[PDB]
Assembly symmetry: D2
Homo-oligomer: 120 residues x 4
């Protein structure tokens, strides 16, 4: 249920393959339709989730370096997949930039993204 | 500078290899000296960081499933590596458990870890 | 624009007064229509926000103790008010429980709430 | 045990009064010894905590507006007080700036502070 394409509510999209034993691998495109905005992502998921209706825990990282861009930063998304009609991956994220020590206190942004199988 | 073993301040340790083009791969052991507490981790880092003194952005995920344990949960660490004498990886983390929809609001813990090359 | 009643998307509601010089005071009801679920809240807001279209920064705390309940915990909401038609207070929150030292690492939940002037 | 002066590990300090029924009121000084860096804070704490060794949950907000400064932003600290020799208030914080809608995704920084009764 995880393998495939997902869209957040703001114009990003990623493509992921969920390996049989817990690997996540794919590509994150921060601006739909812009190939210069595609970055590697890698992560993990629970490959034997509960069968009681609960979601499937997962996480992934994108370091914002590709051939076109280096933001000197990385985002991690932590969340759960919820299957069915209206499947979704509900996440909260942390975006850390490399900083000097004086600026470390402002290194890390927090937010949330809801991913769906259809565009907003 | 990232490749190798790191210890948080509370008794965990991980081992990571930083690939030339941004891959992080390794193992996270949640309780030092307990092999049943070793889990796969995967992530990304900025493989061309700034040279102005700033840290190197990175992130990784551990899904808490191995042959001995399934917590139906995953932690992502987001942070930066700071090299030199007293090298450290300073992070903030998100731990999401798979939940029912009614319990989703309590799915995700937040915290921080400081990793060093020597044990606390 | 802040003074008044707000509803999150999940069944809570609060009532706030925004004082002229930055005070927030009011009541948070975690379950709409249940008076046993009303708790004091107090906080602050920027009483001279930018006039360029940007939101108004604010935050508040509820300690989850009233005459009916003590969860030994407190939530802080940090966010911004955005006025107009479809006014909203967009927030992220931290819920810390009192814990033993051994359990401190799991003391704090994170999430988000969007408040509107009309019920979901 | 909460009433009094506390210092984070980076050069801030605040002064708080813990009211008998859960109020926190005081002043936060972001740069020790600089009176232009003093801002109102208000919050809540659990005024009947557990007696089993667990910490006392609390939170507070500072909106970063005073007579000298307006950063158009507010920080909330969520945490717990732990008494005894080496008393501490262990916190995680969210700092939200007022932003345009386009920039909302980058509105909120996250971090942590440990407060002690003695300066670092
Ligand atoms: Cl796999
Ligand atoms: Cl690589
Ligand atoms: Cl006021
Ligand atoms: Cl009081």
């Amino acid at each position: 249920g995880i393998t495939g394409t997902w869209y957040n509510q703001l114009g990003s999209t990623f493509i992921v393959t969920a390996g049989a034993d817990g690997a996540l691998t794919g590509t994150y495109e921060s601006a739909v339709g812009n190939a210069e905005s595609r970055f590697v992502l890698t992560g993990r998921y629970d490959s034997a989730p509960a069968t009681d209706g609960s979601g499937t825990a997962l996480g992934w990282t994108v370091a914002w370096k590709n051939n076109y861009r280096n933001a000197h930063s990385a985002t991690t998304w932590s969340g759960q997949y919820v299957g069915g009609a209206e499947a979704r991956i509900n996440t909260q994220w942390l975006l850390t930039s490399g900083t000097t020590e004086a600026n470390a206190w402002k290194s890390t942004l927090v937010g949330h993204d809801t991913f769906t199988k259809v565009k907003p």
